[PDB]
Design a protein around this ligand. Structure first.
Ligand SMILES: [Zn+2]
Length: 758
């Protein structure tokens, strides 16, 4: 299993995946492939747990297989894959179903000489405006192509009319506000200096759109400790002017129309400001800081400017300054295996959710960079980022000497990201099913609108659907995700993703077309949310049962272990989820760590959750065939004492060195002559001019290139220390936290399915 599974697909799907077939199961996430649209949404935008949906609710209940979709609206595409075409229908905007409001797509059935079309989602009959399509041919675009995006491709965009904007008025360009903690803790490590210096260069790479040479995103700057410092950087100043706001609680942040400026025009003053900030706070002794007020100020600033935007916070410590949102050092580890453990993943106060809502109403997305030395209550501090569609980064015990690269890498990528603003997503389906649950980083007021203050190409929204009525095996089950958003240039657009699935009446067709990784992605996210309101033990029980039942049901619908072919890895992956820190934390696992990873997994795509739960293990030494490495099962049992291995879970990279490793290898890789001299915990390989060093360093570069976040490297020597913590990534083995081992987990699952049928 695992190793061979990914290799089977790897050999049976290296050609292009063309999305022209209805419920076609895409290649495995562990397989490299090229996608050619042609009708269905590419798997990079949407992946389902099931590609051949049961036609009725009774049939579905017979299998107990959750029907879910993991959606990534603005997924970043490989260079070779075409981005969505933008269709401009002028003032009338895109044609939509008069009843269910689904947008014109490749599935709409035209009838009666094309004067009308039957809606594929609800079957309502709709008139076709006489100039609807001809309009596309009279804009300054080339018209030689036969196909029209909205009628032939799974994914495309529409320019939106004013009817799709707040106050029936087109939006203005969004803005970025950098908010820096200049308390003693932040200044002493050199973080402030590092950040200010980088910004001098980074602000020139703000997101740009259609050939725009200059970004239209204006910037604002704010520093803070227990008070906030707003800076005026109007282009006609040679020096930045500071306006302090000491009144926290009652706030009040005045205009100061020198806030939010074009980076090119204020280049000199901005540069001066970034030279000043570190100097100005150099001798500070302030240790207490605020948090909520910072987010309130930045958000209020965007509101005053009547534009949406993002706030980038750089925080170092538990906010214990007297002020709205003040927190306590509640990290109580005796609360863990109890009925009140959920309290550690919940925010301390309700001021956060309340503030998150205000942000969403204003199209304000917040990104949080944490650099903690002690408990800082990540769970609570990441509430606004999460409900706002933002991201959270953590650098425990931050130190320039060890984290400059990783942090600068994350920062640069985060600021340069393609991003959407003040957005909303809705998923329409063919009559018979409807979206019933949503998971991810977002906000929901009602039961249908997935509100996204901010959005980028790494975040995913997972949707669960349940039967409403009956589906036809001939009509299939259609899905249409519609994203309404404002771009980095201030343009309002809609992005549509259509995915057509099959409908089946024979249970055997349901079992042949499920996708395990996607199921795991769903199940994991379901469990990770459950931890907020249920004892961990119950959440784990629920997870085990979901899997036990689908397996038992398969047994009675269709002794030895029996599983459909496409679910041969469900058991193994299920054991990995149960053994993750969020559900079975080791003795050294921190509460902030759990909260942090929990938030991360809630927004992960199927690719990330696959490698997060089942890390990739690559043997390095012995087969030096230049170009031609194949991964190994995650077990200490596959670890040879005379070899070296690289392991990655999408967040951390480990280089494991066997104690019996060859001397030449150690020389060529670490530049020391014996295994004993290798530095335990080394986080950067020296640059040595030899084939083995070049190859390993390159491998590290290409692995880092395929993960959204910069993975820290840790060299692990075989005998002592960090060796034990590394054990946790050999997921098929027994863990000290009372993990089971795959084999024993199977035996147990086998008996669990027995108790359901006995
Ligand atoms: Zn309709």
């Amino acid at each position: 299993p695992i190793q061979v599974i990914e290799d089977d697909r790897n050999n049976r799907g290296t050609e292009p995946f063309v999305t022209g077939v209805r419920g076609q199961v895409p290649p495995l996430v562990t397989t490299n492939f090229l996608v050619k649209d042609q009708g269905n949404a590419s798997p990079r935008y949407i992946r389902c747990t099931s590609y051949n949906i049961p036609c009725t609710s009774d049939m579905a209940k017979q299998a107990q297989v959750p029907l879910a979709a993991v959606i990534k609206p603005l997924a970043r595409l490989p260079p070779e894959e075409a981005s969505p075409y933008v269709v401009d229908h002028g003032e009338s905007g895109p044609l939509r179903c008069n009843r269910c409001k689904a947008y014109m797509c490749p599935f709409m059935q035209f009838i009666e000489g094309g004067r009308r079309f039957q809606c594929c989602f609800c079957s309502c009959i709709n008139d076709v405006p006489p100039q609807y399509f001809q309009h596309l041919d009279h804009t300054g675009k080339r018209v030689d192509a036969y196909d029209r995006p909205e009628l032939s491709l799974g994914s495309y965009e529409f320019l939106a009319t004013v009817d799709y904007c707040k106050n029936n008025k087109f939006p203005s360009p969004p803005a970025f506000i950098f908010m820096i903690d200049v308390s003693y803790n932040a200044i002493r490590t050199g973080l402030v200096r590092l950040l200010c210096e980088e910004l001098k260069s980074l602000l020139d790479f703000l997101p740009r759109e259609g050939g725009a040479e200059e970004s239209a995103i204006r910037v604002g700057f704010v520093t803070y400790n227990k008070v906030l410092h707003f800076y005026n950087v109007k282009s006609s100043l040679a020096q930045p002017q500071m306006m302090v706001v000491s009144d926290v609680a009652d706030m009040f942040v005045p205009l100061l129309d020198g806030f939010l400026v074009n980076v090119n025009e204020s280049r000199a003053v901005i540069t001066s400001l970034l030279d000043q900030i570190p100097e100005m706070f150099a001798d500070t002794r302030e240790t207490e800081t605020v948090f909520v007020p910072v987010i309130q100020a930045g958000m209020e600033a965007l509101k005053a400017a009547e534009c949406a935007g993002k706030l980038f916070l750089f925080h170092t410590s538990l906010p214990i300054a007297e002020a709205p949102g003040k927190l306590k050092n509640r990290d109580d580890r005796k609360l863990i295996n109890t009925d009140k453990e959920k309290t550690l993943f919940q925010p301390q106060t309700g001021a956060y959710q309340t503030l998150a809502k205000e942000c969403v109403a204003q199209g304000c997305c917040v990104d949080l960079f944490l650099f903690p030395n002690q408990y800082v209550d990540v769970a609570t501090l990441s509430v606004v980022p999460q409900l706002t569609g933002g991201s959270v980064y953590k650098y425990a015990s931050f130190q320039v000497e060890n984290d400059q690269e990783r942090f600068l890498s994350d920062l640069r990528r985060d600021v340069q990201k393609v991003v959407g603003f003040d957005a909303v997503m809705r998923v329409r389906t063919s009559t018979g099913i409807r979206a019933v649950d949503f998971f991810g980083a977002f906000y929901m007021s009602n039961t249908t609108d997935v509100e996204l203050a901010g959005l980028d190409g790494d975040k995913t929204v997972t949707v669960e659907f349940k039967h409403d009525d009956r589906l036809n095996e001939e009509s299939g089950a259609l899905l249409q995700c519609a994203l309404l958003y404002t771009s980095c240039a201030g343009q309002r657009r809609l992005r549509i993703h259509n995915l057509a699935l099959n409908c089946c009446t024979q249970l055997a067709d349901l079992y042949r077309n499920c996708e395990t990784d996607t199921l795991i992605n769903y199940m994991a996210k379901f469990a990770y949310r459950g931890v907020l309101n249920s004892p961990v033990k119950a959440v784990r029980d629920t997870l085990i049962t979901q899997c036990a039942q689908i397996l038992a049901c398969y047994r009675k619908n269709c002794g030895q272990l029996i599983l459909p072919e496409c679910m041969k890895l469900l058991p193994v992956y299920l054991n990995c989820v149960l053994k993750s820190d969020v559900l079975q934390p080791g003795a050294e696992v921190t509460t902030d760590d759990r909260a942090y990873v929990r938030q991360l997994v809630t927004s992960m795509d199927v690719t990330e959750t696959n490698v997060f739960f089942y890390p990739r293990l690559l043997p390095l030494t012995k087969s030096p065939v230049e170009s031609t490495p194949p991964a190994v099962r995650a077990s200490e049992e596959r670890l040879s004492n005379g070899d070296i291995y690289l392991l990655e879970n999408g967040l951390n990279l480990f280089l494991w060195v066997g104690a019996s490793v060859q001397q030449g290898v150690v020389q060529s890789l670490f530049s020391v002559s014996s295994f004993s001299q290798i530095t335990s915990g080394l986080s950067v390989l020296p640059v040595l001019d030899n084939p083995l060093s070049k190859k390993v360093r390159g491998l590290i570069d290409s692995l880092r290139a395929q993960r959204s976040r910069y993975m820290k490297l840790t060299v692990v020597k075989q005998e002592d220390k960090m060796e034990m913590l590394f054990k946790h990534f050999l997921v098929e083995d027994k863990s000290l936290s009372g993990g089971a081992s795959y084999v024993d987990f199977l035996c147990h699952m086998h008996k669990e399915i027995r108790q359901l049928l006995s």
